[PDB]
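Q: Got a minute? One more chain.
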Amino acid sequence: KNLANEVIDDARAREITDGVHRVLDRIAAAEEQAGREAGSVRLLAATKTRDIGEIMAAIDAGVRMIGENRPQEVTAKAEGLARRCAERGFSLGVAAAEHIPFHLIGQLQSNKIGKVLPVVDTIESVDSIDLAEKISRRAVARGITVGVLLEVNESGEESKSGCDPAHAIRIAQKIGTLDGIELQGLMTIGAHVHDETVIRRGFSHLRKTRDLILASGEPGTDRCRELSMGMTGDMELAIAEGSTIVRVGTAIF
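A: Always. Here it is, folded:
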């Protein structure tokens, strides 16, 4: 599939538009149920495997934040996406134009960091002090600061991605001391299970962890405010537990 394709047919554009609208309505309904103020939750469209035409249909329908999984897709679509967003009056990733964050939400192989620093403003998949240091070295050398979210494993399965939940605070504080990076919150893929008590426990843990990091007042931790959690199948629960960013793919595309 040519991800650089910029034009889709009318029916496809309608599907994506309705998808975005349905998701936005679900987010609003979820905020209402959880007694949270409107706008508390931001929608990030997970754009993996979608082409430029598809992604822009989503942005035109109301999406104001996107996240790619693979650096190769970032490189393939970055130029066209930036141009299309600019024409629509938006700035994308990295004067009164609204800014649309461009995040990397998939795992980042070390030798691919340089591929995403010129485009993404936030790397949501930082799962270790080691990775954070590698990103720091490269950001400093480039003369920039990139946002990062500490990815925590809330699946209960050691084999999954993300840092050890018990070590999250310690790792976050260390990340806060690194130059070239700005800790903007936490992220989790959650648990791919049908047990809502397990799902809720993980989101709750992420929220509490976020709260403790902010409370620490340690260097570079005052902006650790986001909670990127919840996707198509569990966004209602994520929002009930405090999510500030939901990552949606299927419900949209």
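A: The radius of gyration is 17 Å.
Q: Perfect, thanks.
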